[PDB]
């Protein structure tokens, strides 16, 4: 059903002699041109919505001192992550999608895949680290401990280490970056069993270390937090404000957990199917179904984690309305 070569895999059979290198000729045989136009349109959407919302976060952080607290660093980190998702991934894929194929060759594939994977992993591990920080600060699990600047910096560096420990192996021999789906964007190889780079062990290490571990850490930390808040509000039913707080905190934890699942579950499940029923017939459009949900997390992660944060909100309505409110 496919068509392989030295540094790619076109999910389209060369029985008709039409398949060409995704680095060299347009792939209008695995998708009409208008579908490449819609690919470019969606990239345009993700840039027009994703760049303002994420850059503005860093901006208002520069304007408002009450935002430059350590328990906010990871949020800033998230914004930077999304910008790596925007300029390392979304814009490149816009340009290449407008040509019908990946014009920047194998090296450009390694770059666009390295920065797209990097940004996405920084975002994910920032979500995990944030959950850990809120568990520690709110649940008070260690005797005589308060959260300082050095702890926050440590957390950000941990996100960077977990990201590099997930984006660098394909550049040096563990798995590899190849054009995915409609061959216009580059990603981690999990649809060929390429033994020379040991794709199977890397895909297992992804699913276990960079999916199961974060999932468990988030669910644990936020379950513990909702327990703590529920329990305190139970011991304080005379305080209506504590009741409000219990409600809002529960609703937010549900929103964040469900958003995490919507974001990373399709990628894990579809990729795991392409690595459990591997080798079959996979429409490029079928291949771009989890990447949709994951890539849109550069837009709704700032909406959930920043725009729904009363501090950041306030400072943004202040900045955009250039003075008051």
């Amino acid at each position: 059903n496919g068509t392989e070569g030295p540094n790619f895999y076109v999910p389209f059979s060369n029985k008709t002699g039409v398949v060409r290198s995704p680095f060299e000729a347009p792939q209008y045989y695995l998708a009409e041109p208008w579908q490449f136009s819609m690919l470019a349109a969606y990239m345009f959407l993700l840039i027009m919505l994703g760049f303002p919302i994420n850059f503005l976060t860093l901006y208002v952080t520069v304007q408002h001192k009450k935002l430059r607290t350590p328990l906010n660093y990871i949020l800033l980190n998230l914004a930077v992550a999304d910008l790596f998702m925007v300029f390392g991934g979304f814009t490149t894929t816009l340009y290449t999608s407008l040509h019908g194929y990946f014009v920047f060759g194998p090296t450009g594939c390694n770059l666009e895949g390295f920065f797209a994977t990097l940004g996405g992993e920084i975002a994910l591990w920032s979500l995990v680290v944030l959950a850990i920080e809120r568990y520690v600060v709110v649940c008070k699990p260690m005797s005589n401990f308060r959260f300082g600047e050095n702890h926050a910096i440590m957390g950000v560096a941990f996100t960077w280490v977990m990201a590099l420990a997930c984006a660098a192996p394909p550049l040096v021999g563990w798995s590899r970056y190849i054009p995915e789906g409609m061959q216009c964007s580059c990603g981690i190889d999990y649809y060929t069993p390429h033994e020379e780079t040991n794709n199977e062990s890397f895909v297992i290490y992804m699913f276990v270390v960079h999916f199961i571990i974060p999932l468990i850490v988030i669910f644990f930390c936020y379950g513990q937090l909702v327990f703590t808040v529920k329990e305190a509000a139970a011991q304080q039913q005379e305080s209506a404000t504590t009741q409000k707080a219990e409600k809002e905190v529960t609703r937010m934890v549900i929103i964040m957990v469900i958003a995490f699942l919507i974001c990373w579950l399709p990628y894990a499940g579809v990729a795991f199917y392409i690595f459990t029923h591997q080798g079959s017939d996979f429409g490029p459009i079928f291949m771009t179904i989890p990447a949709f949900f994951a890539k849109t997390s550069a837009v709704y992660n700032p909406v959930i984690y920043i725009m729904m944060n009363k501090q950041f909100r306030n400072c943004m309505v202040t900045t955009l309305c250039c003075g008051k409110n």
């Binding site: 328990l71 949020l75 600060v137 703590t228 808040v229 404000t241 707080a245 944060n309 009363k310």
Partner: peptide, 11 residues
Amino acid sequence: ILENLKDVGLF
């Protein structure tokens, strides 16, 4: 924990 909730931006 209302103070902690505001610190972490959850309330």
